[PDB]
Design a protein around this ligand. Structure first.
Ligand SMILES: CN(c1ccccc1)S(=O)(=O)[C@@H]1C[C@@H]2O[C@H]1C(c1ccc(O)cc1)=C2c1ccc(O)cc1
Ligand SMILES: CN(c1ccccc1)S(=O)(=O)[C@@H]1C[C@@H]2O[C@H]1C(c1ccc(O)cc1)=C2c1ccc(O)cc1
Lengths: 9, 226, 231, 10
């Protein structure tokens, strides 16, 4: 999910 | 880890440094009003995500848990932010520097004036308590974490409680006054939860509608509440 | 008022004495559960509990100082939270089950009988487990339940009374031998759980409204009015 | 008036 991408950075 | 090793002042300075900026809106109708709020919220969300990674202990958690916390807490966090910046504006919500709305302007969107009134009452409460910036950032972090991993989260929460008490004792409050103020602040979090749940109910109602476009990120957050 | 002049120990004695009775459900073991029969059982239980809740609230120090309109508002806002904290409290010594009544002890698979209920059942079980781990004391429980009543609809007299209940909580923890740091940490842990009880109530209220609009069971005139207050 | 209003008086 989008939230998951933003966090994973 | 190193989050639990922080002093109270370091915890406070860390939360202070992590604070997001105050964003401008693109300041009518149900559609226009919702457009403005949605666009704002969407931009704020990106800053919130990077703010959370600076909340001590948060990045220690699994990515799974980090996602879960933000999905659960994002409206609470937007709301406590709003209430904080509206404190010195009695009867008004400072959504943005160029977007100061009153309860009447909240009538433009159905069911929104009820939430507006609750937000206003919360701002009035913070104003009466003379809530301090250092207390606000602690409360906002508590919302994120509250709303061996589960023990880690609880260890960090105790640390933030220690930090709140530190600020109060440093402010000269008696032991009895510290405990009372700690309780007063944490009980406001119940009200912030309540407002978030009510608002979320409206959001995934106006969604099923297609009143406004709402963004992919927002749609995914919103979808997690159902 | 009168509440403001009570000692901590007097506050605790007042709250313990005011405790409502534990009621039985009208559970009928001769027939299997349906969504409807389950909802009927819980609704009937809650309705009977509400009457004792009203008597209890009038014995919470400071509550009767309020206008009738304000008393109505607080109970309208808080009634499901209050039923819920009661449920979680009496379920503490029943791991994995919710003790709705001495003759109605349910696990989550029985919660699945009603659409949307198992999710809340899981949150209630978790809250009960959390109280069990913290070894919540009965004296602490009555303080928290009174806090829910005074707080959940409050947004000066009410705040002065809430401050007295905070004093009483801390007093209880000190008496139990907790260090000064352990005291404010526990105070905070317990009050943060109230946010989760608020959450559970809101989710439950949403579903209760859904059920009424689907005519699963007849709600009492009282429950109809309590429910309507949230819409 | 509300039922609750009535019960609070009895
Ligand atoms: C979600 N709400 C709502 C209520 C009625 C109709 C539609 C939405 S709400 O609770 O009133 C919420 C508080 C504030 O006003 C709403 C709202 C909002 C948030 C996201 C969104 O996509 C649309 C609106 C608000 C808001 C927006 C930005 C903030 O920083 C703080 C609060
Ligand atoms: C209202 N809820 C609900 C959820 C999904 C579907 C239907 C109802 S709920 O939050 O799970 C609520 C908790 C507990 O189970 C429900 C429920 C209930 C309350 C009133 C009513 O008319 C029907 C049921 C419960 C309950 C009943 C009595 C208690 O002492 C404590 C809890």
């Amino acid at each position: 999910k989008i939230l998951h991408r933003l966090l994973q950075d | 880890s190193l989050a639990l090793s922080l002093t109270a002042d370091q915890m406070v300075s860390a939360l202070l440094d992590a604070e997001p900026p105050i964003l401008y809106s693109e300041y009518f109708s149900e559609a226009s009003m919702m457009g403005l709020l949605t666009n704002l919220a969407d931009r704020e969300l990106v800053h919130m995500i990077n703010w959370a990674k600076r909340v001590p202990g948060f990045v220690d958690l699994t990515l799974h848990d980090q996602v879960h916390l933000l999905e659960c807490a994002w409206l609470e966090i937007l709301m406590i932010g709003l209430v904080w910046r509206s404190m010195e504006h009695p009867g008004k919500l400072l959504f943005a520097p160029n977007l100061l709305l009153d309860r009447n302007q909240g009538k433009c969107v159905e069911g929104m004036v009820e939430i507006f009134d609750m937000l206003l009452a919360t701002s009035s409460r913070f104003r009466m308590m003379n809530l301090q910036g250092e207390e606000f950032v602690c409360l906002k972090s508590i919302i994120l974490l509250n709303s061996e991993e589960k023990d880690h989260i609880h260890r960090v929460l105790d640390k933030i409680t220690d930090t709140l008490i530190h600020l109060m004792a440093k402010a000269g409050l008696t032991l009895q006054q510290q405990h009372q103020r700690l309780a007063q602040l944490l009980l406001i979090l119940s009200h912030i939860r309540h407002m978030s749940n009510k608002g979320m109910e409206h959001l995934y109602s106006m969604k099923c509608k297609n009143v406004v476009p709402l963004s992919d990120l927002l749609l995914e957050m919103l979808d997690a509440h159902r």
